[PDB]
Ligand binder design. Sequence first.
Ligand SMILES: [Zn+2]
Ligand SMILES: [Zn+2]
Length: 80
Amino acid sequence: GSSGSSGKDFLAMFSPKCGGCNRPVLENYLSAMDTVWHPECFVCGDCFTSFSTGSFFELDGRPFCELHYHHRRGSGPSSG
Ligand SMILES: [Zn+2]
Ligand SMILES: [Zn+2]
């Protein structure tokens, strides 16, 4: 009449992870919003376009493209 069990495998990694797949980025990784991302995931939220052409924009901690990024700021709900 005695049971018990200890010893599990928890997050054994401190390094950051893409803000989309939650994977440990090492090579060919980006650094946005004080975090890391993937050169394939890091894209807009609406049009979901790559940020290769130019630079991206941070809107409430979310990757967006000038096109939308701006549209949202104006005609639409926005906070300051
Ligand atoms: Zn990713
Ligand atoms: Zn967009």
